[PDB]
Paper text:
[name] is an antiphage defense system of [name] that specifically cleaves invading DNA that are methylated. Furthermore, upon binding of the endonuclease [name], a higher oligomeric form—tetradecamers of 12 [name] and 2 [name] protomers—is formed. GTP hydrolysis by [name] bound to a recognition sequence powers DNA translocation, and convergence of two such complexes on the DNA results in nucleolytic cleavage. Here we present the structure of the [name]+ domain of [name] in complex with [name] at 3.6 Å resolution using cryo-electron microscopy (cryo-EM), which reveals the coupling between the endonuclease and the motor and the mechanism of activation of the [name].
[name]ΔNC is dumbbell shaped with the two hexameric [name]ΔN rings tilted with respect to each other and sandwiching an [name] dimer. Three-dimensional (3D) classification resulted in nine major classes with varying tilt angle, indicative of conformational plasticity. The two protomers of [name] in the [name]ΔNC complex are related to each other by a two-fold symmetry. The dimeric interface mainly constitutes helix H9 and has a total buried surface area of ~3000 Å2. A particularly interesting feature of [name]ΔNC is that the [name] stalk blocks the pore of the [name] ring.
Numbering used by the authors:
A (entry chain C), C (entry chain B), D (entry chain A): 168 to 457
B (entry chain D): 174 to 457
E (entry chain E): 173 to 457
F (entry chain M): 3 to 21, 28 to 267, 272 to 348
Write the structure that this text describes.
Amino acid sequence: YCLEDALNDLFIPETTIETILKRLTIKKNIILQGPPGVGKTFVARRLAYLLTGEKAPQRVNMVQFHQSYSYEDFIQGYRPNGVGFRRKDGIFYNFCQQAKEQPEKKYIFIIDEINRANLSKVFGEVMMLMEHDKRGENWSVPLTYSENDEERFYVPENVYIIGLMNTADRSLAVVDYALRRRFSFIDIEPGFDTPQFRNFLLNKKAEPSFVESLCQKMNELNQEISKEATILGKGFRIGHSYFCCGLEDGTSPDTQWLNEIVMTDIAPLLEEYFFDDPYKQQKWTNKLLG
Amino acid sequence: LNDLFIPETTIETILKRLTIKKNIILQGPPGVGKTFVARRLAYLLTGEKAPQRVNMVQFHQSYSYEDFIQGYRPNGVGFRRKDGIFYNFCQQAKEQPEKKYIFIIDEINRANLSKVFGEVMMLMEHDKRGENWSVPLTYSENDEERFYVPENVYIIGLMNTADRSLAVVDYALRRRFSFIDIEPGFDTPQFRNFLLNKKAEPSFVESLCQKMNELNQEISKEATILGKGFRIGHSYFCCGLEDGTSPDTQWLNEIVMTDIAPLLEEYFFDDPYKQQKWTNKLLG
Amino acid sequence: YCLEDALNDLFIPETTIETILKRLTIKKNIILQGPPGVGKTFVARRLAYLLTGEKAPQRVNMVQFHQSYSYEDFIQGYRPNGVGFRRKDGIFYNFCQQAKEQPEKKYIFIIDEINRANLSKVFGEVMMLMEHDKRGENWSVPLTYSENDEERFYVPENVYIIGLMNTADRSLAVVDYALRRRFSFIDIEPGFDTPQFRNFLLNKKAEPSFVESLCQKMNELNQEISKEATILGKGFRIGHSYFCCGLEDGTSPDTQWLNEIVMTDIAPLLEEYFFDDPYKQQKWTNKLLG
Amino acid sequence: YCLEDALNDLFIPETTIETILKRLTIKKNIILQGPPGVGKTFVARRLAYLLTGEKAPQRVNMVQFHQSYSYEDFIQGYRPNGVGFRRKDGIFYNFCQQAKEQPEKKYIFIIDEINRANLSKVFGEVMMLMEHDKRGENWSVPLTYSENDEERFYVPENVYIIGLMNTADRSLAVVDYALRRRFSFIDIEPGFDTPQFRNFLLNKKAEPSFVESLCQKMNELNQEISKEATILGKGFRIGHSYFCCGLEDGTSPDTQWLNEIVMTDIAPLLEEYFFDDPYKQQKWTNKLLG
Amino acid sequence: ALNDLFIPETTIETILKRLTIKKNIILQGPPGVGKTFVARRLAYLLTGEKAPQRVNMVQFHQSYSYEDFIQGYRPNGVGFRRKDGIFYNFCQQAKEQPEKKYIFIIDEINRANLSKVFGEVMMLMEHDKRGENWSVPLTYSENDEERFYVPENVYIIGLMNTADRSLAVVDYALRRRFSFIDIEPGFDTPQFRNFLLNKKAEPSFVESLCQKMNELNQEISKEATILGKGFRIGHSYFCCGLEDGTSPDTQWLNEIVMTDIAPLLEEYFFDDPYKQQKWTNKLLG
Amino acid sequence: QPVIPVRNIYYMLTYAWGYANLEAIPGNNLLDILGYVLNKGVLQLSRRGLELDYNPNTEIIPGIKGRIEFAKTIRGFHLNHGKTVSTFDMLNEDTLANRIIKSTLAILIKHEKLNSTIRDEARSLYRKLPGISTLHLTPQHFSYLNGGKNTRYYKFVISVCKFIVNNSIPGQNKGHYRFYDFERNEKEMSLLYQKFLYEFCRRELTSANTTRSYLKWDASSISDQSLNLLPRMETDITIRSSEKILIVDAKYYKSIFSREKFHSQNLYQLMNYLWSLKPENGENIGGLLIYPHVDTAVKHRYKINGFDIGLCTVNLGQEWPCIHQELLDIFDEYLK
Ligand SMILES: Nc1nc2c(ncn2[C@@H]2O[C@H](COP(=O)(O)OP(=O)(O)NP(=O)(O)O)[C@@H](O)[C@H]2O)c(=O)[nH]1
Ligand SMILES: Nc1nc2c(ncn2[C@@H]2O[C@H](COP(=O)(O)OP(=O)(O)NP(=O)(O)O)[C@@H](O)[C@H]2O)c(=O)[nH]1
Ligand SMILES: Nc1nc2c(ncn2[C@@H]2O[C@H](COP(=O)(O)OP(=O)(O)NP(=O)(O)O)[C@@H](O)[C@H]2O)c(=O)[nH]1
Ligand SMILES: Nc1nc2c(ncn2[C@@H]2O[C@H](COP(=O)(O)OP(=O)(O)O)[C@@H](O)[C@H]2O)c(=O)[nH]1
Ligand SMILES: Nc1nc2c(ncn2[C@@H]2O[C@H](COP(=O)(O)OP(=O)(O)O)[C@@H](O)[C@H]2O)c(=O)[nH]1
Ligand SMILES: [Mg+2]
Ligand SMILES: [Mg+2]
Ligand SMILES: [Mg+2]
């Protein structure tokens, strides 16, 4: 795989990706935080093939956390084979065994919606091990379910961790500050005001006037949201994904097309962001239409 | 497409939205035939009235990921990994890619949607359907075995808007789901024509819509407490008249105390006078 | 092994280290409380080699508590065998038997992130026996899952226990005051003001003015944290670990590098820390950048 | 087993120990209720030897309760073999049977940290028999796990039960109902303003005035704690055991030795106590240092 | 059966009109109203054949769970077997007899979590979704060969009570699927008066009692919040003790007030004994 | 019978708790203001999302969830009927912080004197919290929450809930509640005022350093060095700057509200604070007595015993910003 293969369709600036790859090679653990709809899940699979340099899914494992996810499933735990229970090497443990086999090649573990599951309980022993300076046999630790002290588990040096955490929910946040230190936090923006976003639209036979009107509209709307940081921070701001998909057939993005999507998706979304002000709902919606 | 009380435009909107987006939420108060819409609609997209393709479930506060997708549960001998319905259902559609298999989820609001769906909360998106986006599940014994939504799957969500929960708001799930409101449709001819084809009086149908709508406007009057999501549905009138009893004021009066009166109590709680007032307005 | 080797690179004052051994050797159970990034994990491996006087791993055991450790895991519990359950001696019981195998040479048990687990549930009988006075065969006790035939378990005198409780998570704080008396609590400071931190940078190709400004700003910032106590207490103040790492290749410290640190990691930390006004965030970020 | 050896070293008044012996012979179910560091565990070992009049381990048994403790271990229960289930006589069941052999000789059972475990889960059926009046073969009962109704278990009159409970936690504000009826609570004072504690300190090369200044501050400080009931009750007050320890070398008490204890035990202890008012910590901590 | 019931005949007509169409119903009233006896006579009334076999009754509690109700795994002599519950076995009994109406009685329904017990079935019991088309595989139905469907013939009556002020608003699950009916104590009704004149009660003694209980029942229901209409006393205490062989009399009433009404009055108010002493004495005379 | 306008009091509570438009609401009385803040305040939170704290659950279920506890599993023989005792983390909003809100809202609804619009809106909210369990609130519950794990916003409304609970009294009916006449009693209003300044001064007077200072008597006694019987003396506030120090004693009196004799009993405390206080820098020592007045504000200066002391008043009920201006204007003069 190569870098420019990714950048063709990617709306994120190159500076961010180089910023991302610079940290990740150093820190070995990163968190991409932004609102939904900016390609977090999209980039993460791409970035892995860049970092490895080869399009190998075998070396990549991609998982989505949720409430009913535990250390027993993730790392190690006792589970029923049948009549008799057995100790089950979890998925992350299995991934680490594979990466050991090929120390040269980078192996990458991608966790979507990380903020949901109780990370302290899930990672546990890993919470110390995962740090860039603490990887290797020197800091090897025996596990909970290890038969004896001799059995010890150490993260390989090659391992890189990428986490995707939406900023839409303040309820679910990485408040565990000790965990925050391990991860290098990389903000990601909606990225309306980019050429690559604009060129994709023009590539789909789109009006340059309508496009420049669109970017100015959303940028102003997003700015209104970020202002009221008490109520809604920048983390809530709308992403570009609503506009991206749905044009695969070849439908031109006319003003009528914009009018439909606003009615179905953004309009009720604005109701939630602005529950108290109905006037504010009509104002921004009609601004797009007018 | 004949007995539906909803405009043809709304269903016309829905089918394009459903085919395009592949996931939708039909949100409205109880008694608007949300279930009948989806059940009717599901057969349309298939093109044939096939019930085996369509599966319906009713979420509730205790519903869990153990039931839906995967889970460890006991066989006769002991515990095993038990493939949940949706995993079984997607496998069923995986068997036949060409035909369209549908999944209906009622009372969706009650359960903590993030908790139940979990892994598929990403995968369900129309773009991320296929082997490329597959992921290993939580309880998967081996990392290599993964789960992916097929392209044929379409999901329809039926939500009661009368119990808003200020517990968890998720705007990310809202990205997957394109939300569609449904009005009760008293004014619509299709509801009126049905009753006039049941030996109703022309004025009585006209009298009913004026009476009920005044209540709905009062309900939608106070946006903070109540809304269009709370307002009364029509389905109560549909049922009970196919025996052969044509509409009459007494038939309405039966429904009023039977059905509407608790709803009013719930909505206009701790205000009996408003209940007696609005109840009595309808009888005249 | 000796103090000169250990204290060669450590940024902690000598004051604590002898104070630690003064408290440790008399009391034998301690807790090192400080925010993350002050070398709590870092020193603890080094301290173990001092007391034994040698660099031996066998006499040392290292673990982390992840809110799922239990008495069944720590001390005595039942595990599935092939068809049926068996009794397994936990790691601590396994460790103590080795520790009393030879009393002369000291044995250390290291428990990272001790604050998390419900320690009363984990230790059970041991919470009494751990204390220095109540050690040896005199205070021998039979365990819960011990055999009906009388067999008793006593903490040997040689054992010393070290705990590493971070001070960030307030909820995860010891309110089992009966247990907080068993341990002696040693505060560890961030370590900016100390020269041994400063000297490390200057040795690694750093300007003193840029260095002294950096420490000057951080200590001002940390006092603002120390000023508040409602949410952000004294303990929350930033550690020195962020600046320690990432310079091994030869990258000299400069405002560009400092700008990378501040934008990437700390600036997210501050907005989570304050989450009331961005201006307080914009102020202090710009101060560090300035 | 002479009182002179027993009671001279002890700090507690001879008034309270005699009353303890009165109710203990009378009622045989006793609870010593005081904060940690007042010698609850220390007295209990001595009192048993007092009542027996002899130093015998077999007649005296000691245990600490915790959440994992259950009926199945305490009294009777089934432990799995490799496949099969074998019944196992528990401690108290095994212990009383010894006391049955020698009904004349007094037997003692000591339960430390009793509040941590629910008594009902452990004792269960036996809480009826454990009571002082309903003992002896007249009130005998067959056990839950007994093969037949014939086998019966009755608490012999000779056994006396001691339970050591600490008034240091908010959970114990709602005292368990089972304890109040069947046990007789006794309050253990902190006992700074005591002759023997002072005489102990003077014996270890301590200035008299320095001792009196110390006690007044602790006695004054403990009064401050006792005044509140909402966050810190009277039971929260400091015990007399921080100062006992650490003088076995012969090092004299002084501000230097005192400073170690305050900073490493009592200073952070106050931080946990007086979170709302950090100044209150500085107000008291500096007061003690002076 | 009709005449023996003490409630207005009009309400009796109202209920079957609801149940036949709605197929799910819940009765909420004070304790001591004969809610169990009501449903039984009503259950036999709907069938018309007075068969107890058709009727089965269960009383819910918080421990009550899906394994007891529907299906679960129970220990064998060695190992364990799947053990069919009440409702699973009950419905298949009615499956043979489609025409024949079969009834299920759920007492103290509000205590338990309806969702937890029913599980899957909570939708299938809603009348719109009934019969073979709406089949669902059960949680423990390991194979896909067999599915559980509640047939149309089933009718479900629930006995709930408004006694306790601790109870908050009813669970939302119930409201959707159930029609709420409030049952009056029925003192005023002639059928209760003819049940005491049939026992040679004095009309003054009868007329006084009807006014007397109403006088308390009016006062207890006057309170808006703590004590509502649901609190007011029912008539069941008066039945048991009269047709056994003992005639009505003022002293017969006097014993009953001490027996049930006097402590019950304490529980409801539980604030002023003088208020209790006033009313308890007032009841006697 | 003059008292402060009620809307102004709420601002003083705000600084007291250490952390919006009140012009719109038409109910002058306090509970109308306070409920509208809470009732509106909760709506702000739910928009961002309420706190969900992982409560671990040890329960008997028909299957494996999370970690099975082998001991309780075998001893209770739950394996045989296909069940295990397993530990897992249900995610609820049933936390103590959130439970407190719902219980307080019930009290708010039950209150006899309340605006109808306010009561109606809350009843919706009470319905909107199905999972959360109502509770009978005590300060001991509030005591446990001093840890302050919750966010900064939660702490604001919780303090509000503290005010309501303590200031709730049953009225006409057994169920209903009636609000305390807070303004009338001087002690709590005075104790509010003393706290109001201390947190206020830290905010605005960034130039100066503000801390409450404990003071020790110059006395020595042959009987007892402790002098425990002597009155405890802790300043209301001290606002120290490099050029000049200043001690303030502020209290709320009813007599002073009438525009005659003057109630200045607190002054007797003040000089003794000056005496026990000894400055190392020796820049200066100054004192201030400040009281609340309704109509107008008057400032005086005095030179009493070698000390420069000011007596001053503030016209509460004027306007909140002009009051805020007046306070900064006042301290600026004396801080010199
Ligand atoms: N074609 C194209 N699509 C993009 C680009 N950026 C984002 N998207 C699209 O937006 C959709 C979602 O990507 P995703 O990473 O899952 O967004 P997200 O923020 O993670 N969503 P969520 O947080 O809800 O999981 C996909 O259609 C993705 O391809 C882009 O640069 N080009
Ligand atoms: N070279 C060097 N590194 C130090 C020094 N002090 C701390 N560090 C570094 O800072 C990083 C973290 O130290 P660590 O012991 O893990 O801090 P911690 O308190 O244990 N972390 P946590 O609280 O999150 O568990 C490591 O890179 C560690 O080596 C020091 O004095 N010299
Ligand atoms: N020499 C001497 N030591 C005492 C005296 N009282 C307490 N101690 C010492 O205090 C230390 C701890 O006493 P202990 O009984 O364990 O307190 P505790 O109540 O059991 N602690 P906890 O409540 O935490 O379990 C021991 O060294 C004990 O001997 C005393 O009167 N004389
Ligand atoms: N003809 C016709 N029947 C309807 C319509 N809406 C509902 N019904 C019938 O009303 C009954 C109950 O519908 P249901 O799904 O339970 O109500 P909902 O789920 O709250 O929307 C079924 O017989 C529906 O088919 C409608 O719009 N037209
Ligand atoms: N004969 C007759 N008995 C009645 C009537 N109503 C109630 N009862 C009697 O009252 C008793 C049942 O009362 P009930 O309230 O259900 O008892 P509870 O469940 O404990 O509250 C039985 O003796 C019933 O026969 C009635 O109308 N006629
Ligand atoms: Mg995504
Ligand atoms: Mg660490
Ligand atoms: Mg003890």
